[PDB]
Ligand SMILES: Nc1ncnc2c1ncn2[C@@H]1O[C@H](COP(=O)(O)OP(=O)(O)OP(=O)(O)O)[C@@H](O)[C@H]1O
Ligand SMILES: Nc1ncnc2c1ncn2[C@@H]1O[C@H](COP(=O)(O)OP(=O)(O)OP(=O)(O)O)[C@@H](O)[C@H]1O
Ligand SMILES: O=C(O)CCC(=O)C(=O)O
């Protein structure tokens with residue numbers, strides 16, 4: 001099981017899960033998150049390369065990907081990374097990468113509610 | 116709004132990322148520009164919050180994102196500015212996230 | 227010499243550069259030739275009765291690297307995205323907690 005190392009971020013309450021994967025898997029990934037009860041997410045189309053350099057490389061070799069950013073509590077990181085990795089997986093190069101980033105604060109605009 | 120940055124001692128810069136209704140973008144940008152905040156970066160995005168949209172990809176709602184990097188001391192004020200201008204009073208107004216930043220470099224004058 | 231000392235223990239960092247779109251091919255070429263192991267591109271807009279505003283297209287690169295590579299990569303990006311006129315953009319360095327490769331479940335490294 002995926003175990004994310006958050007030890008260099010003691011006291012951080014919230015993390016951002018940034019998942020970049022094949023565009024055709026977006027509905028699967030979203031269904032898996034919806035079923036788990038995910039409390040929100042943001043989707044952006046991006047382009048990129050990993051270790052294999054696309055397709056040296058140039059802009060023409062960058063490959064279309066879908067990105068999701070999912071801010072979750074610390075306690076939910078591993079579960080959510082695991083769900084997104086499992087849903088996005090095919091077993092071939094280019095299946096994606098997940099970056100976990102620390103978040104200092106969350107503020108709901110409608111209410112001014114923080115934390 | 117008070118922002119808890121105690122977990123990041125010694126961090127000098129933060130990124131304020133606001134995701135909000137597209138129609139409020141000109142209001143948010145005007146309020147920030149008038150207050151003297153620069154370096155705004157805008158990306159259109161699609162999303163859901165706690166109510167699960169308008170769930171599947173067709174329930175994702177268009178939103179506008181604005182990212183601004185400020186110093187630690189400026190976070191609370193800039194967060195408040197953004198919140199006040201994005202506000203409408205209805206669910207779906209948006210969220211603001213604050214993120215630590217290690218370093219800032221201006222390309223035109225990089226050493 | 228990027229000051230990463232408020233991030234003890236953090237292994238990976240994200241280099242985020244926002245710059246003129248016409249410089250994209252050259253930035254990519256430079257990083258490719260130098261041997262970069264990954265990047266992500268996003269188009270974004272800079273913000274240049276309501277006051278007079280203008281949205282200006284820019285290109286964004288996010289490049290996650292190990293600590294040791296941060297200064298070299300920042301230097302190459304700065305040099306390739308430079309024109310010397312006002313409006314060249316900015317580079318930020320952000321801490322990253324974890325990196326997971328989906329195909330393999332491999333983390334870290
Ligand atoms: N170091 C990195 N920095 C920023 N973005 C990255 C990086 N590595 C990968 N990405 C992004 O994630 C996408 C998917 O990467 P990819 O799945 O090809 O990873 P990889 O490490 O090459 O693994 P694999 O060997 O399975 O292909 C890339 O197209 C790019 O958008
Ligand atoms: N946990 C999250 N992770 C990442 N993005 C999110 C998260 N929650 C909200 N967002 C982004 O912010 C947008 C606005 O969220 P919204 O304002 O609906 O927040 P909410 O917590 O549901 O507040 P409210 O009850 O006022 O609707 C979303 O459409 C999405 O793009
Ligand atoms: O993204 C792909 O579909 C293949 C290319 C790849 O894995 C890479 O550039 O790392």
Ligand SMILES: O=C(O)CCC(=O)C(=O)O
Pocket residue numbers: 162163164165166167168169176206207208
């Ligand atoms: O974004 C909206 O307009 C309403 C939907 C919502 O608030 C949500 O999904 O959380």
Ligand SMILES: [Mg+2]
Pocket residue numbers: 049050051052053093094095
């Ligand atoms: Mg790859």
Ligand SMILES: [Mg+2]
Pocket residue numbers: 163164165166167206207208
């Ligand atoms: Mg909502």
